[model samples]
Target chain A: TKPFSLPILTISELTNSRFPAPIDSLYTAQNNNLNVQCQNGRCTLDGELQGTTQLLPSGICAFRGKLTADVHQSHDDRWHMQLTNLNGTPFDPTEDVPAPLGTPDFTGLLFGVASQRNVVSNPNTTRAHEAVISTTSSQFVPKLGSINFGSTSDDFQLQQPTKFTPVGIKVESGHDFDQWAPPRYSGHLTLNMNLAPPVAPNFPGEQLLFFRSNVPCAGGVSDGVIDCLLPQEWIQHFYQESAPSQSDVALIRYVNPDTGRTLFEAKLHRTGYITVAHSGDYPLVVPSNGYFRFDSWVNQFYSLAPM
Target chain B: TKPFSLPILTISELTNSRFPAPIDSLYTAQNNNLNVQCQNGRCTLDGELQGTTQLLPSGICAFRGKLTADVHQSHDDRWHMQLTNLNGTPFDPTEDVPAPLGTPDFTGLLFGVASQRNVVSNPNTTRAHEAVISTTSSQFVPKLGSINFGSTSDDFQLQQPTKFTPVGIKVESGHDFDQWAPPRYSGHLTLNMNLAPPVAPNFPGEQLLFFRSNVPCAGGVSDGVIDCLLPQEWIQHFYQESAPSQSDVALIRYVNPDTGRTLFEAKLHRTGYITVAHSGDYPLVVPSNGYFRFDSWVNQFYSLAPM
Candidate 1:
């Protein structure tokens, strides 16, 4: 009788020709603006704000999304991170999900809490102030590596260019679920984005690429209303600084998919922010893997200042 | 009440006053000679060598006597120490005997080894080399400090100032007991003497002190012989160089029954040499206690070398 043994597998082999074909391209978009309305010394947003939702490039390529919340109010208040798919399916903002906790996301979802409050002011309004949130929970968070879906060489190019949105979700005090009120908190969100698949000109030799964006916004607006575009130069700078050492890196196209052509198409470092948020409290610690996993995507919107 | 316990001897104090109180005064005479005979490489002398022996007034005191043995021939042997009263009774030189080894017979015994042969020229001339021989089987080796005995306030002097004699005892090789002709491998005998006592002009702290003389032989005779003097000056120098702070601290006098005139007197340093044997091998381990208390004592002559 012969003894049986299993073949050893390497990471390179797992991400190459042996994998299955991917579904839709991982196209991501986030809500970028927030406006706050107040009545009777209290803040509220009446259905004018829309929560951000982006589709994960369907397929088993290991996708991760986070929310980084920022707030502008001085008072201590609770914060939350809400995630929803493109179909509007929401996921709980808790630890059962794995995400970075304390670095990028102002919320406790990604980059954890800023030991100190990161305050910002509205360029247009002298009375408004906001807090930029950050987190660094990269624990067990899948790293952007050489992930190939199939043996076809073209599949490498099939990966949608990574998208980043520094979303802002503003929450104000004195606002109950039943009563409509103005929002008072404002927040600044900074996003650090890293992506895989659409392999850069510099492949394994230099895989990690970064992008950073800072989005500022005021909170409280009509319910379900979201303004998302921010300084395009900031995103352009992020990709310019972090792209691999080769000619063709990922491209940044600024266009609304449903309406018109992109405002611009620039080479991207594949890392940066898209939107920001202002919330009463940020960094909701979503526990995952026995610890807090952060969501940088949601935290971005949550970390905005209220008008 | 069980014989009420008597007042315990709580304040029991025992003060020890050493016997044959150390001699203080010393008188020095210029030239003195004695008759010494050497046969078969063995030398014997009687009748105090001129300027050698002296008498003190009374009380406790000590005497300094040095002899020089110049071996005129390659086989010219050495000498040892011996002290006796006028009755010619010799002191015992036994080990394990409580010291004060023996009484300082007015006709005291003072002996050391000297040789005529240059150790460099004849390494194996042990017979002619000076050996502090003892009459008794016990080892009561004499040292400057060991043989200190006399009336404390007595007056004594050196009648015959003994000349210095360099012996081949510190021979490079071939003259030790291990290689001696008869191989009398046992103990060593030694003699101590002083040319003069220390002197402080105003504070006449007179006492007979001993110091090893490093002078070449007198009369240009290379017979390895020396003259013994009251070590007033040498001891004074040592005192100044060593325990100078306690200068002229004590007054010392010798007990020379003959001529009451202080043979030699000066401020004396309360320090002396301890005889130690350096046998075995090099890089020896000295005992934890500072004193090198071991078997033999006359293998080498050491002075107060600072520490």
Candidate 2:
């Protein structure tokens, strides 16, 4: 038997100072190095970030800090990295001497993971690679502390035909300065990524996906009356910008998995966010592993509402 | 402000082989080394597990493998580690020559994370340290294909009085040979830990911390009709090994947060997993943050049934 070994990549960090505006600052950090060690399936990384300065539009502040983190994969294939300690100076704007003008100091941690998948274009040459990165962080110590921020980029194409280089790099961050302070800064950025197809393309024309009951209607139970809340994600994807109308017709179908049997199929009337009581004749039955599928055609709608 | 720095600790791994009988083999690997590197806030570990041998009861086989993994922490304080590649020989039993006697060969990856917390004893001497380690893995190929296994240990004490040595060293591993494999070798060891306290001590006899509804039941709703499932962890701690009888009286109480007022207090009948329809005279109105609490006494029960 041989001991299991895992590779540890370089642990890097970057610090930035935002003054009157976010991004109007400087950032720097040490590059990645192969100075990692692993034994018996476990690996570790330990290092520090040197001090730096923040050049802001309003003023300048001295920023210095160091941090340590640990990363490892769980047996279930879920990756885990924990920043058990986060400490640094200039993290708080109010504490800065002769404090920079405009926005007050707000500090938070940035943690994210990027999983890479190869997208083979041809048998001979690899076309491109995609990295899906999800990051969530919390800003603390302010009046309203522990503000959470998260973002995900699924279609990150890292290679293209034109330049043979990664095209778009989307990075989003959020922070909050007190409302009492002028220019209360709190927003996100979707950078480098293309804007043509709309971040999330809507359904073609009026085509859409809807939910139906997994179990069949029996013993007075309504056919399409699903006793579960529509998943927020599915709801967002279905009605990206428009409100569903009662006039919309949802074609519901329940099929058997093993036999490909269409247990029941009917056009149910949409009532919008309610227990849809199908008044049709054929009762639907969902086998043990069977499921229901729903499709609808409706006008698209959009809103700039805060989530 | 001083930068926060957390100490990085060594991670260890072990493997065992079972054949016609369980525990019929041996294994070892390289000890911990200072091969970790950290910069800014991130850390990395890169290394490999050395080779070893599997001594079966009647036969012998050689095993070797190398794996690469990355570990990091997200902003939300959750740790993540991903295995990039796992290349090893003899990972599948059928692939082994002469097929080891008895059951088929079984292999799986083991990943675990242990978060350590100190429990202060006296001013001068430390009392004990607790380590909550969670491990999840999947058994793949050979026998039953890709069976996911996970376990969590929340109450692991590491030190006590008399001697100044760490006490608890719990390690869990799993493997499968055949369908009729007796004892089905899947168990965890709680080494260096005391045996008397029974790992997790139950609450004092007839006394325990109970669940409380976050708001008082209102509009014909009973005070204890909480719209939530009792957390499995809480249930485990509350009942230990016991089963509550229908005669077991559960004292339910609801209180208002705004005012230190007891909205409703009564002994609710437990019909075991039911939605109680309250038709009481008093229309209970739960305060914005009010909740209900339930406590009871019961006997322990055990089941050999599969979940």
TM-score of 1: 0.14
| Full-model lDDT for every candidate | 0.19, 0.21
Instruction: Give the C-alpha lDDT of model 2.
Output: 0.21
TM-score of chain B, candidates 1 onward in order: 0.19, 0.20
Cα distance off (Å), candidate 2, residue B276: 2.5
DockQ of each: 0.00, 0.01
The candidate 1 chain A region of ten consecutive residues with least summed lDDT is A15-24
